[PDB]
Hints:
The structure is cut from a larger assembly and holds one copy of chain A, one copy of chain B, four copies of chain C and two copies of chain G.
Chain B: E1 6-9, E2 15-19, E3 28-32, E4 39-42, E5 56-59, E6 65-69, E7 78-83, E8 92-96
Chain C: E1 5-9, E2 15-17, E3 23-26, H1 28-32, E4 45-46, E5 54-55, E6 61-64, H2 74-84, E7 100-103, E8 116-124, E9 131-139, E10 144-145, E11 151-152, E12 161-163, E13 175-178, E14 183-188, E15 196-199, E16 202-205, E17 231-233, E18 244-262, E19 264-268, E20 274-278, E21 289-292, H3 294-308, E22 318-319, E23 334-336, E24 341-343, E25 353-354, E26 361-364, E27 367-368, E28 380-382, E29 388-403, E30 415-417, H4 424-427, E31 433-438, E32 442-446
Chain G: H1 4-7, H2 18-23, H3 26-29, H4 39-61, E1 70-76, H5 95-103, H6 109-130
Bound molecules: a molecule of 5 linked components (NAG-NAG-BMA-MAN-MAN), a molecule of 4 linked components (NAG-NAG-BMA-MAN), a molecule of 3 linked components (NAG-NAG-BMA), a molecule of 2 linked components (NAG-NAG) (10 copies) and 2-acetamido-2-deoxy-beta-D-glucopyranose (6 copies).
Domain Retroviral envelope protein GP41-like (chains G, H): 18-131
Transmembrane segments (chains G, H): 1-23
Coiled coil (chains G, H): 100-131
Amino acid sequence: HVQLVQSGGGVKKIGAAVRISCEVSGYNFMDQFINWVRQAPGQGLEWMGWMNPIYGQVNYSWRFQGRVTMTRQLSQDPDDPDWGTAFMELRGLRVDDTAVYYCARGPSGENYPFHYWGQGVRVVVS
Amino acid sequence: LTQPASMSASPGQSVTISCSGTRHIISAWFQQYPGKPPKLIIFDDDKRPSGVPSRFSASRPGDTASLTISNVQPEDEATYICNTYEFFGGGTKLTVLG
Amino acid sequence: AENLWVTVYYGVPVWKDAETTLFCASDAKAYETEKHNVWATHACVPTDPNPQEIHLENVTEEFNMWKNNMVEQMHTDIISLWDQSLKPCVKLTPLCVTLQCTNVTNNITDDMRGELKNCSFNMTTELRDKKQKVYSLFYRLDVVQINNKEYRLINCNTSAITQACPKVSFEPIPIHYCAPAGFAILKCKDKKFNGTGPCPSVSTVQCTHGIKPVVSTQLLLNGSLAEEEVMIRSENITNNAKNILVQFNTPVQINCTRPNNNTRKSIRIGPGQAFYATGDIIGDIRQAHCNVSKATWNETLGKVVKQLRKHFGNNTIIRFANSSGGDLEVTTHSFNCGGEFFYCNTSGLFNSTWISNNDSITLPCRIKQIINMWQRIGQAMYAPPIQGVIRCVSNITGLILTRDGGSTNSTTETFRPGGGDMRDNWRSELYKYKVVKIEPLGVAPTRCKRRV
Amino acid sequence: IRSENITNNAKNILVQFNTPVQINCTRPNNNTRKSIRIGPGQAFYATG
Amino acid sequence: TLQCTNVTNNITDDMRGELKNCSFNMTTELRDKKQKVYSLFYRLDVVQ
Amino acid sequence: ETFRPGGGDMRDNWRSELYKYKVVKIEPLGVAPTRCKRRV
Amino acid sequence: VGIGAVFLGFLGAAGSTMGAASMTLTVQARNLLSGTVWGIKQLQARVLAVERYLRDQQLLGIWGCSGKLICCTNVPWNSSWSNRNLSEIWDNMTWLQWDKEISNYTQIIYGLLEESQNQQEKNEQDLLALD
Amino acid sequence: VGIGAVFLGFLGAAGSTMGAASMTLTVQARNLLSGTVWGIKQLQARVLAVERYLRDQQLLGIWGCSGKLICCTNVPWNSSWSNRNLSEIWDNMTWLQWDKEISNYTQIIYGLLEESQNQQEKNEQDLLALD
Ligand SMILES: *[C@@H]1O[C@H](CO)[C@@H](O[C@@H]2O[C@H](CO)[C@@H](O[C@@H]3O[C@H](CO[C@H]4O[C@H](CO)[C@@H](O)[C@H](O)[C@@H]4O)[C@@H](O)[C@H](O[C@H]4O[C@H](CO)[C@@H](O)[C@H](O)[C@@H]4O)[C@@H]3O)[C@H](O)[C@H]2NC(C)=O)[C@H](O)[C@H]1NC(C)=O
Ligand SMILES: *[C@@H]1O[C@H](CO)[C@@H](O[C@@H]2O[C@H](CO)[C@@H](O[C@@H]3O[C@H](CO)[C@@H](O)[C@H](O[C@H]4O[C@H](CO)[C@@H](O)[C@H](O)[C@@H]4O)[C@@H]3O)[C@H](O)[C@H]2NC(C)=O)[C@H](O)[C@H]1NC(C)=O
Ligand SMILES: *[C@@H]1O[C@H](CO)[C@@H](O[C@@H]2O[C@H](CO)[C@@H](O[C@@H]3O[C@H](CO)[C@@H](O)[C@H](O)[C@@H]3O)[C@H](O)[C@H]2NC(C)=O)[C@H](O)[C@H]1NC(C)=O
Ligand SMILES: *[C@@H]1O[C@H](CO)[C@@H](O[C@@H]2O[C@H](CO)[C@@H](O)[C@H](O)[C@H]2NC(C)=O)[C@H](O)[C@H]1NC(C)=O
Ligand SMILES: *[C@@H]1O[C@H](CO)[C@@H](O[C@@H]2O[C@H](CO)[C@@H](O)[C@H](O)[C@H]2NC(C)=O)[C@H](O)[C@H]1NC(C)=O
Ligand SMILES: *[C@@H]1O[C@H](CO)[C@@H](O[C@@H]2O[C@H](CO)[C@@H](O)[C@H](O)[C@H]2NC(C)=O)[C@H](O)[C@H]1NC(C)=O
Ligand SMILES: *[C@@H]1O[C@H](CO)[C@@H](O[C@@H]2O[C@H](CO)[C@@H](O)[C@H](O)[C@H]2NC(C)=O)[C@H](O)[C@H]1NC(C)=O
Ligand SMILES: *[C@@H]1O[C@H](CO)[C@@H](O[C@@H]2O[C@H](CO)[C@@H](O)[C@H](O)[C@H]2NC(C)=O)[C@H](O)[C@H]1NC(C)=O
Ligand SMILES: *[C@@H]1O[C@H](CO)[C@@H](O[C@@H]2O[C@H](CO)[C@@H](O)[C@H](O)[C@H]2NC(C)=O)[C@H](O)[C@H]1NC(C)=O
Ligand SMILES: *[C@@H]1O[C@H](CO)[C@@H](O[C@@H]2O[C@H](CO)[C@@H](O)[C@H](O)[C@H]2NC(C)=O)[C@H](O)[C@H]1NC(C)=O
Ligand SMILES: *[C@@H]1O[C@H](CO)[C@@H](O[C@@H]2O[C@H](CO)[C@@H](O)[C@H](O)[C@H]2NC(C)=O)[C@H](O)[C@H]1NC(C)=O
Ligand SMILES: *[C@@H]1O[C@H](CO)[C@@H](O[C@@H]2O[C@H](CO)[C@@H](O)[C@H](O)[C@H]2NC(C)=O)[C@H](O)[C@H]1NC(C)=O
Ligand SMILES: *[C@@H]1O[C@H](CO)[C@@H](O[C@@H]2O[C@H](CO)[C@@H](O)[C@H](O)[C@H]2NC(C)=O)[C@H](O)[C@H]1NC(C)=O
Ligand SMILES: *[C@@H]1O[C@H](CO)[C@@H](O)[C@H](O)[C@H]1NC(C)=O
Ligand SMILES: *[C@@H]1O[C@H](CO)[C@@H](O)[C@H](O)[C@H]1NC(C)=O
Ligand SMILES: *[C@@H]1O[C@H](CO)[C@@H](O)[C@H](O)[C@H]1NC(C)=O
Ligand SMILES: *[C@@H]1O[C@H](CO)[C@@H](O)[C@H](O)[C@H]1NC(C)=O
Ligand SMILES: *[C@@H]1O[C@H](CO)[C@@H](O)[C@H](O)[C@H]1NC(C)=O
Ligand SMILES: *[C@@H]1O[C@H](CO)[C@@H](O)[C@H](O)[C@H]1NC(C)=O
């Protein structure tokens, strides 16, 4: 199947860094770009960029450049070569981004549009 | 992409939803439960995933994407998301009275 | 003229599309030196000269550079030939001893970090009872700390490290791709070739034109040009997940080098294997660098802007920006120069905003020895040091860019240099060829009879 | 019962009966796999 | 050489310890350093 | 007549699975006497 | 230089009229067989080519011809598949249109041809044996 | 089993009389050639099959027929080996009896046929050359 989970939400004081983890398995991790979609209450979905785990490629939006780091971790040992972890570190967040973050992905061989989605980590700022 | 806020319906009625813009670049329709991950219900404007009732159909003669649904089931109130590759629409709250 | 008689004709000219295993061929230039002194020199047939190409007419065949065979497989062939070249070479397994290591006694500043670390450690000689102490030099990207700071090679815990034989030289050598008897290579000679869909005038060949595999993420080095128009080869340009290949006509002369003078040194690791390390650096210490000629670079970027403005509307704003993350070999473009790989950055070029209405450009490098190319899970190879000063003059020919996922009505459509994998390095070389399977034995109706 | 010459007492005798017999089998001891590093890239998988 | 003992089970005389708890040295990635690791083996995998 | 459970090797495990197959080589090109003549 | 290269090339006039297709055939009949890592690749290519050629030759042979290169069968053609006028059938269209038009309707003409030809040598054998 | 078995079967009437075996021959002539660790086994099996088929075809070729399937030769037959009445030789027994009856006298019929047919084309060559 297609297994994907999230971790690391919560509420944080302004000026700190929020770490959000998305751990995926059940499919070969080399392909299938991670797409990081943020959903702000009271409005439709907005997109904040995507990541590619072959070489940690990133592609941000017109707003987040200079505030986000979309890092990754592959599997070191060939025992389980399809266990991937995409991390997103968000820094210096304003008070107006209390939202829910999903790590979506795409079909076999492409990236658009999103089929699978995540339960979603909710982040609030105080 | 300037979608309607919300609309109401009654069981047994067929309604059409129109998405504006999209400049003829193929749109998609997402059904979302409140506080849940929406799953794809229409892509390529011509196909639906397995497990979807056939009452859903979509097309796009021009720029606007028209999605028509028939015999709406009473417990199918949800929110609807319009997708244009990278963007995301305004969404609509469809409420079926009982 | 009313009876319809069936006939079958052999040798009918008619083909179809098929997926098949092609056939390599090596030029006589690689054959000039033999006994495996070079790379991929005794693994192919000699190429037949003076081919019998015939200029076809009145044929409208379609290509599809993205959904075509013969390109997804040549990567497999290249990687298999590359991997088979390390089987008879040395292994570094007993090397990962705790290197007691210090800084080179250079006249460094605070910011300019010591790019050479002088590391001493123990090794096992031929006599298994005795152990010797030897010293060597490593670049800063080959030591990670554990705790007079003990260092170890970065990929030792990751996987076993294989040392490349000094006999082989990594320089690319021209290759030819012929088809086994029965197939044909349809190449179409259109000038303004989009690459997908129909192509007006075609020609059948038995072997490909000179193709050379060069590993380089951004700004593919030493490539093949375009005919008249600076081409932008990605039809599906609106979706921002796919890279955008650009191929501009006049080449840009990228001239780089390393001016240090390495002194190779030999240590005995066992009965038959030798470990080739860096000795004492003699002469001056500097930073390996690249130069690009400013006027040519600026004119080429202007041409690229002109041709990109057609696919996004006339009145729009375009501004480039350097890569914004990733590994050290896709953050900045990587290239092999003289048998060693430069991870030399490229933030001095992609920085120009073009509204709608010679001082050589220098750019600094950093050098790495151990490499994990093609991102194989458990294979890290060691590049032996090259003695002296090293230099190479190369032909920048294209770009590999990625758009920005701008929402709303983004006018300043910022692009980035997006290296991606090494497959797009070749997809710009094998876009004009399709492999067709000849299907003889055609069937046709006509009038005739086989009497007795 | 598949052997004609059954009289010689060295060759085995194969029997194949029509209805199968259900045989269940299991171990309930809950093992905990553990990883140890045996070398540069190789793991030894012992019991915890 | 495994320095090995018996699992602290509530065994009887007949029910021999079917899990032997063994400890032994092993070579890590750093060739100078050696570690002491413990593991469990079945009785039919150790000879004295 | 006492019987014992005799395991033997692992080949008798399979021989009960492949008792109903034999591999035959087709030999075309039959020869036969009859009455005909290759006319001129 | 000369017409020899054109008449002994490779698919020289494939897209041209079927008259020019029938003009040269040896460019296809002849240029179909001759022409420690990758040796298995080379042998696999060679065996695939030879097996395909022998399958083709056998498929011809079980029919009413083996080496005529130009085979005319003694059974009629159904007027429902091609549906093209036979007066101009040899000049205007191209084999790259024949393959399109025949792709839907094939692996059945072969069956009819082989069965009818089989009956042909069967009753010919019966007649020659009784006479 | 259906008439499709008769049309495109495999040894579908092997045990029947040769009279009922002569009607279908294509199911044997065609189903004889068509149908990476073990790539060596693949190459071995493929070359074995293809070489057997080519040996068979050449054995036909050195005789006076190559593609007529049924082959009738102009030489007499010794009446000491089979010794069955030729009136019912074609309807009562089976090929699975023919191979038995002719097994003892083997690799000499091919030799006699080969030499006699060889001198047959010798005379043919002499006549055509003197013509
Ligand atoms: C890969 O290689 C590329 C090569 O282009 C590098 O790209 C450049 O990186 C440097 C990083 O230093 C940047 O260029 C400079 O950045 C400065 C930021 O502050 C630095 O400089 C001040 C001194 O003013 C130091 O005190 C401080 O500690 C930082 O080191 C800018 O301030 C610079 O602009 C200045 O230019 C002149 C210089 O005299 C001044 O008069 C100006 O007032 C102005 O202050 C300069 O822009 C920049 O990121 C890249 N520059 C270019 C041209 O591409 C990559 O950094 C390298 N990779 C990595 C990982 O470093
Ligand atoms: C694209 O083409 C350019 C040139 O067209 C090419 O640049 C060439 O790079 C190679 C290195 O790969 C250079 O080759 C060296 O040249 C020096 C002289 O400057 C020679 O001394 C070298 O030979 C030594 O090393 C050999 C290694 O085996 C030894 O066997 C030998 O005995 C010598 O010790 C070596 O030949 C070459 O000089 C340049 N070209 C020019 C014109 O200088 C570039 O590499 C190509 N693109 C890519 C990606 O490779
Ligand atoms: C791409 O180009 C941009 C151009 O701005 C580069 O951004 C600059 O990068 C340098 C080095 O990473 C930054 O210097 C650092 O600044 C931080 C400030 O927190 C300091 O702590 C460090 O010690 C160092 O001095 C610089 O600030 C930064 N400038 C901006 C405006 O972001 C970027 O590095 C380039 N990326 C690549 C891959 O070339
Ligand atoms: C790397 O460290 C070694 C330590 O053994 C240096 O070797 C000695 O360095 C001192 C310092 O100048 C010299 O006086 C000795 O003559 C060196 N001995 C040998 C055998 O070389 C070595 O010089 C250091 N490397 C560099 C470049 O300084
Ligand atoms: C190389 O081996 C020698 C001995 O074979 C090491 O010298 C001693 O090593 C022990 C560790 O077993 C340390 O406790 C001692 O302090 C070392 N002696 C001295 C004088 O330092 C040596 O450390 C090893 N490594 C190097 C880089 O020489
Ligand atoms: C490549 O380009 C476009 C989308 O980027 C597709 O071409 C057509 O574009 C029009 C509007 O521009 C759409 O209405 C059509 O549905 C698109 N398709 C066709 C067949 O006309 C094209 O499909 C894209 N390529 C792929 C593989 O989707
Ligand atoms: C990089 O090297 C090329 C090739 O050498 C340079 O082109 C000429 O090189 C010769 C000898 O190397 C010089 O005498 C010429 O003066 C060079 N041409 C020019 C216009 O200077 C090329 O110039 C070098 N790159 C740069 C940036 O100078
Ligand atoms: C991008 O190009 C610009 C050239 O305009 C350079 O950055 C400027 O460099 C000048 C020279 O010192 C400074 O006075 C400016 O403050 C710099 N910034 C701007 C916005 O003009 C430099 O070559 C490149 N900068 C980067 C960050 O890549
Ligand atoms: C790097 O330095 C070495 C040593 O300083 C140079 O070696 C020269 O080698 C040649 C031929 O073997 C001798 O004729 C010279 O006398 C050596 N130089 C010295 C100073 O002894 C070597 O040439 C240097 N590298 C380069 C590229 O010049
Ligand atoms: C860099 O590219 C240029 C042009 O693409 C090359 O120059 C021509 O290369 C062709 C290739 O066979 C030769 O036939 C021409 O004679 C060359 N002309 C000139 C004026 O050089 C060039 O060879 C490439 N490589 C280098 C190192 O410049
Ligand atoms: C297997 O079947 C039986 C058991 O050995 C054998 O049949 C006997 O054959 C011998 C010699 O031909 C006769 O004297 C006996 O009369 C046969 N048994 C009976 C009960 O009549 C047979 O020989 C065995 N097979 C082989 C090949 O040895
Ligand atoms: C197997 O033997 C090891 C000895 O190294 C035991 O490890 C310790 O055992 C004591 C009890 O004797 C505990 O108090 C410690 O907490 C144990 N330490 C560790 C790191 O496990 C181990 O418990 C024995 N295994 C079993 C199942 O008893
Ligand atoms: C594992 O290795 C350690 C040390 O590397 C061994 O401990 C030493 O054992 C010898 C022999 O019994 C003693 O003379 C030393 O005094 C011991 N040293 C220490 C620090 O304990 C140990 O015996 C080995 N085996 C096991 C099971 O731990
Ligand atoms: C196609 O072009 C060739 C060019 O030689 C020409 O001879 C032929 O007549 C053309 N086809 C048709 C149908 O006219
Ligand atoms: C050498 O490089 C290290 C890098 O951490 C630095 O701390 C040190 O000051 C440099 N110089 C010496 C003499 O160690
Ligand atoms: C190898 O072990 C070290 C121990 O500190 C660890 O930091 C490193 O990450 C390990 N290697 C890999 C590839 O994770
Ligand atoms: C690419 O260019 C060709 C012209 O050769 C054109 O027919 C085709 O439509 C172009 N691609 C797209 C996606 O429009
Ligand atoms: C680059 O070339 C264009 C060509 O029109 C010119 O306008 C521009 O000034 C040039 N840029 C530089 C920095 O010389
Ligand atoms: C463990 O098993 C051994 C095996 O004989 C036995 O002697 C011993 O009493 C058992 N128990 C302990 C605590 O060693």
